Design an enzyme around this catalytic site. Sequence first.
Site, short mmCIF file in Angstrom:
data_model
loop_
_atom_site.label_atom_id
_atom_site.label_comp_id
_atom_site.label_asym_id
_atom_site.label_seq_id
_atom_site.Cartn_x
_atom_site.Cartn_y
_atom_site.Cartn_z
CD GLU A 59 -0.13 1.24 3.17
OE1 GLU A 59 -0.75 2.23 2.72
OE2 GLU A 59 0.70 1.31 4.10
CG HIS A 60 4.46 2.50 2.03
ND1 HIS A 60 4.37 3.84 2.34
CD2 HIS A 60 4.60 1.85 3.21
CE1 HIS A 60 4.43 3.99 3.65
NE2 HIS A 60 4.57 2.81 4.20
CD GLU A 136 6.13 5.83 6.07
OE1 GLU A 136 6.13 4.60 6.25
OE2 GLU A 136 5.30 6.42 5.34
#
Lengths: 439, 414, 101
Positions: A59-60, A136
């Site tokens: 989903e990145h 992140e």
Amino acid sequence: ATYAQALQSVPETQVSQLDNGLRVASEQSSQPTCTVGVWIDAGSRYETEKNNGAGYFVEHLAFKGTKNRPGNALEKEVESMGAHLNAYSTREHTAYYIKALSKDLPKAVELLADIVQNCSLEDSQIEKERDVILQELQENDTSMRDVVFNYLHATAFQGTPLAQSVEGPSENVRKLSRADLTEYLSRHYKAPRMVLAAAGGLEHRQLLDLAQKHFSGLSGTPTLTPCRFTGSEIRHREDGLPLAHVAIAVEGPGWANPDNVALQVANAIIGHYDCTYGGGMHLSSPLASVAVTNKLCQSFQTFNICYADTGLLGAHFVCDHMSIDDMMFVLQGQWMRLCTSATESEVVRGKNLLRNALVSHLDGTTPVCEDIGRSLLTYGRRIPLAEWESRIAEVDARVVREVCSKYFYDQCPAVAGFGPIEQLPDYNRIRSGMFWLRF
Amino acid sequence: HPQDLEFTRLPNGLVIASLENYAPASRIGLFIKAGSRYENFNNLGTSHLLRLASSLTTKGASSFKITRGIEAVGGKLSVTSTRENMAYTVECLRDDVDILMEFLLNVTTAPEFRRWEVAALQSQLRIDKAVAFQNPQAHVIENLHAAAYRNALANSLYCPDYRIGKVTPDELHDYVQNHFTSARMALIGLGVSHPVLKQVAEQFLNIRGAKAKYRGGEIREQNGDSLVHAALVAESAAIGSAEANAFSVLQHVLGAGPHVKRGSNATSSLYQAVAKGVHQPFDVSAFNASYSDSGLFGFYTISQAASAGDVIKAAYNQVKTIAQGNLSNPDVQAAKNKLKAGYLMSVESSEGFLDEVGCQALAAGSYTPPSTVLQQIDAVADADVINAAKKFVSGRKSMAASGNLGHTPFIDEL
Amino acid sequence: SSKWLEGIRKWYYNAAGFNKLGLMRDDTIHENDDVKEAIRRLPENLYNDRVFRIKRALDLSMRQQILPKEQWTKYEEDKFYLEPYLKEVIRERKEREEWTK
């Protein structure tokens, strides 16, 4: 205008099934908007050790070039029609929902199908997203609450893959091959385990027609073991930070029990407190009341998280390193008060709190469509709120203290401490203060 | 659902709107024109105190019985405010609204202001000021409004430093008795019947200077948190004007909220222009605040320490070259679609609908449905956009800078 | 019946003693939680006058010397200021007990 007539007045969430195993569900409303999303059961439970954080990485990569559009043309079309995109994943589920408009719908549904089935893997973007996940990790090594809950799961499901975070190891991040990623995307998604859900101002007939138009022909063709709850204590002595973060949980029952509703009544008795509430010396729940009286805590929540027929019945407080002992003492006192010596009016008040909390929880379209997805994942079906109201009416204090005697009375909990946690007692002190000897 | 809202202007001055949806949530929103601009130098930080004054005792119900009754029926009471709008929201399920209405009317009409609660609430003001300004961004916003005007619009939402503790309850009684009138109150109801609201508001209310001027200039807070916050704002237009709608189209052209999380926002030309200018991870967003007399249009950037002024120059020259006739008409329509998307999808639930209907009724003095509001959005042309950008370039500037400000243009280095 | 009753009341006040030591009703209260709460909620000047009279009374008890004749707070010059405050504190104690009931 009464309560049973209001619970009678609700749309019905009409469902259908595409014969790949695809489930689809919708619920209408009279305001000009919609929310269309795909829920696929793919979290850290289905991943392995060396393949940790795979779907999170997918989903990145979900919007960086497909087999029809390039990496920027998808953003161009979404923002030219003006949509609202969001995507997330738990340790269990994976979700892609677009808050969408009442006219740009079928092309966006085709876009969402192209998100599902043809996520291309550009090597420039695998490098960029590897460095983005490094950034992140570098940023989110500071937000203490998620570190607390990851430590809680890590000490709760030790050895079993449920204790693994959604982020997983950085050693996995520095070896993310495209081949395992393609294998993961090809296996863990396809035939039975996906739900399209649409809530808002649309038509269910045309919704299934657009499902026929795009999601048909997907043509897809061995997990969920019982996970051993350990019960232990992890503690991070790290005195550089000013505040202190202490959580404690036990093994949660799950989904197929109305005793979960009884435990939600128990958390409605205790649950949340933040130090900025208007009125501290006058609060109903005695824990936060005496905490305001003694200026001990800053915030807490006693709550539940339910994984797939399991989970963590949890309670986390942020406070000071001179205010941990009496905090835990009055916390266990309220625990055993609900376990043995609960009255009735507090249960009635907690039932009204649970009613109002569920009603204000399911407002808008995003929480409604999320609720539809999560209900049809845990159950295969949606339980409307009138049955929840009837099961609220199925609750008295005797059944509550039975269930609290089942799920608290001399358990082997999981305790996670973070910060200057010198005041935090040893685990056997928690074990002694867990069960009453009636003092 | 065929039913609709009802409007009623009761002649001592108050506004009433009622709605019966067959949704269980009943919400009462009471809006008052008692913002920060209606406080001055003799009551600095008082709106913060009154916003924290929700748990006072009332002549009719002590605050203990207030708190235990409101949480016994389970309804939620909240106090939210902007610089022109105090706002009391009480929510519950549709049968127990009467006693919650009685508590709300007791709190609004009859505060007691007993002194020990005022002292404990001074301690709460200290705690709340810490919780507010531990976020940096709202502090940058408040220093921007301090740099925006020479008058009462620069009064912060929160109490200043020396003002803590030295505010009397008698000024509170005076501010209540001259700023809580009948002609400054809007009563919005969702989920409840009109005549009960009308009769009870007829029962228990029974109550009964100028505009601010432009100042301009800069405020620099040297703080050094490795991220320069820079806000560059000029004065735009009053509330609800076609000029302000043109500025709203212009900020949807420049940059809106992140529609693609973990994306890049390839349509907003500010991001790609500054990413052409600076090859470092930045953030640029557009900004427009609207008020009953004036309005503030500009933008807000978060950048690095030694990488701020180049970002500011890139953004300002991008706005200049848009102002000088480089803008597409499908981009204008895409800004229209983004404005329609924001205005529709900010009012979907009862909360945003409550806020919009209440501000619309208290501001204009009547209701106007959102469909013709979208039609007014669709009635916006291009020369509006060009003149709005020209007005943003032309007039006197206002600048709020904070952080490690070793690389920031002052006045001449634009 | 009525005024003779008031005569008995003045007789008890003059036979009590603290009129000769500069004290009122609100200087001779035994402390509980509620009394200490009411003392905490007092105004400023009343608090200072109360503690000054208390300190003079404890001093004059210390050297065991009672005030001269015309420095005596007689009947009906005292101020019954504490009765609203302490009355409302007992009322709130009853209010907590009635909410828990």
